[PDB]
Amino acid sequence: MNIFEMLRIDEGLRLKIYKDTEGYYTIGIGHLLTKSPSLNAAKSELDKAIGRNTNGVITKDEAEKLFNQDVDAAVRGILRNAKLKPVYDSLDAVRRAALINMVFQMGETGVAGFTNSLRMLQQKRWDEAAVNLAKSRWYNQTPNRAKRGITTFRTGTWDAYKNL
Numbered sequence: 001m002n003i004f005e006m007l008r009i010d011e012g013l014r015l016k017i018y019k020d021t022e023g024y025y026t027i028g029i030g031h032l033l034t035k036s037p038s039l040n041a042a043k044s045e046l047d048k049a050i051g052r053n054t055n056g057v058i059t060k061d062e063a064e065k066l067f068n069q070d071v072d073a074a075v076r077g078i079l080r081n082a083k084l085k086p087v088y089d090s091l092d093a094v095r096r097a098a099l100i101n102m103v104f105q106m107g108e109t110g111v112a113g114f115t116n117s118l119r120m121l122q123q124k125r126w127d128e129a130a131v132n133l134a135k136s137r138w139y140n141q142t143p144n145r146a147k148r149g150i151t152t153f154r155t156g157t158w159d160a161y162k163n164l
């Protein structure tokens with residue numbers, strides 16, 4: 001298991017523009033296009049992202065290319081973030097993947113906001129961090145996904161994703 005396989009399980013793959021859990025236009029493997037309510041605005045962002053007149057539909061390879069870019073960006077946002085970097089550096093390989101997943105899902109800003117949980121993860125207080133992570137809009141709005149990430153931080157294994 002690795003970050004790519006992990007996120008692909010969590011986000012799925014869709015080749016036509018769709019609306020995410022928050023109702024925002026997205027495509028591919030969880031690639032957010034825009035927060036705007038306009039489909040045209042989404043189609044325009046899509047074309048700009050792909051480099052061609054897509055008409056709201058992309059191919060598998062194009063989906064994968066956005067994905068590779070998105071993971072890369074997530075990793076880079078963590079390393080440039082003063083609050084995130086130290087946490088990430090302190091963690092083992094499996095848990096690092098969980099942190100990338102959260103950033104990919106909620107942005108660097110969103111995660112950096114989990115001040116207390118981050119401090120607990122840095123301290124390696126797994127059970128405590130897991131309890132703190134659950135006290136969030138993130139867990140209440142997308143519980144199954146959040147549970148998978150929380151278990152990963154708790155155990156340091158890929159258990160929550162094997163079978164999926």
Ligand SMILES: [Cl-]
Pocket residue numbers: 049
């Ligand atoms: Cl882009």
Ligand SMILES: [Cl-]
Pocket residue numbers: 141142143144145146
């Ligand atoms: Cl969920």
